[PDB]
Every structure is written in C-alpha cells, then in structure tokens.
Design a protein around this ligand. Structure first.
Ligand SMILES: Cc1c[nH]c2ncnc(NCC3(O)CCC3)c12
Ligand SMILES: [Cl-]
Length: 167
C-alpha cells in the first residue's frame, strides 16, 4: 500500500492520473520523481522547467555541478540526484527529443531506467515538448516498465485520449 490517490489502474504495474506532476510530488513526497531531462540537465521548460522552478532553482544548481564533473548524459540514459523539496530522489531520464531528430527507438531504453526503482512518479517520456506521440509513449511504458509507475498527465484532453485509446 502506498499514498498515491485517485489513479486509474491500467495494468498490473502501470497507473495513470490527470495531474500536475509538481503538485503531485509535493503532496506525496515519493521516493522517486522522474524528470523529463535532456543530456545537459538544462531544466528550461516542460516538466523539467516546472520541477526545477518548484525547487527554487536548487535542482539546476545541483545539475550544473553534476555535468561539470561527469559530462552529459546519453539519450536513453539517466542519473539519480536529489529530489529536493519534492521527493527523496529525482531520476533524471533522457528520452529522445523528436524536435532534435533523435531516434524514437531510444524511448524503450529510456523507460528501462525505471526498472531500477520499485515505485516511481513519472511523466510520459518524450511527450510534450520532446515531440513524440504520447499514446506511443504510454504503450512503450506499459511494455517496458515492470516496477510500479504512477504516471501524471498534465493535459486533461490528452489523458482522456490516453485512457479512451488504451488497449
Ligand atoms: C509541463 C508540465 C508541468 N507539470 C507537468 N506534470 C506532468 N506532465 C507534464 N507534461 C508532460 C505530458 O504530461 C504532456 C505530454 C506528456 C507537466
Ligand atoms: Cl511538456
């Protein structure tokens, strides 16, 4: 039993809700919140910009030190950093950004990072400003993640479309 409330159950391990991941994280304080990161951990917009703003830029400060030490992430890769005031940990996961020409096949590799954590709060990878089809992102999530994932979809119309179209 966990404290995630109001979710619709999609499969044995995948759950979904129309919610702002920022407001959800503040309420639940999950062990792991997933960020929709880029390889430079430049949290300018989309989910990343919103999560960073909620940390008063502390996420960005920590991220800049991480990059200065380790260099950029790989597309499809991840790193674990602090969750600041939002969660214990933030799993920064880089899905492919279609508006950069990146290979959508890397979306499965991106979701595989979730399997290293028993329970996560997360957005759909590569959706929104990363330019992929969110229906596809949900399909890859369900077919790749085996741990317990609570998906927050910010747009109500897209959520209803994701629910109504779910196979
Ligand atoms: C932009 C933003 C702020 N807070 C959020 N919480 C959850 N999801 C988000 N955007 C990603 C999508 O849900 C839309 C396509 C996939 C956001
Ligand atoms: Cl977005």
């Amino acid at each position: 039993v966990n404290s995630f409330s109001g979710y619709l159950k999609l499969t044995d391990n995948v759950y979904i809700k129309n919610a702002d991941i920022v407001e959800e994280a503040k309420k639940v304080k999950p062990t792991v919140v997933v960020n929709a990161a880029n390889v430079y951990l430049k949290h300018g917009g989309g989910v990343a910009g919103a999560l960073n703003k909620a940390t008063n830029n502390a996420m960005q400060v920590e991220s800049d030190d991480y990059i200065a030490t380790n260099g950029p992430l790989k597309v499809g890769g991840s790193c674990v950093l602090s969750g600041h005031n939002l969660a214990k940990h933030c799993l920064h996961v880089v899905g492919p950004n279609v508006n950069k020409g990146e290979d959508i096949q890397l979306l499965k590799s991106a979701y595989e990072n979730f399997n290293q954590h028993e329970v996560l709060l997360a957005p759909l990878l590569s959706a929104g400003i990363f330019g992929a089809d969110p229906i596809h992102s949900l399909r890859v999530c369900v077919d790749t993640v085996r741990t317990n994932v609570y998906l927050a979809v910010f747009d109500k119309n897209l959520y209803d479309k994701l629910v109504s179209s779910f196979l």
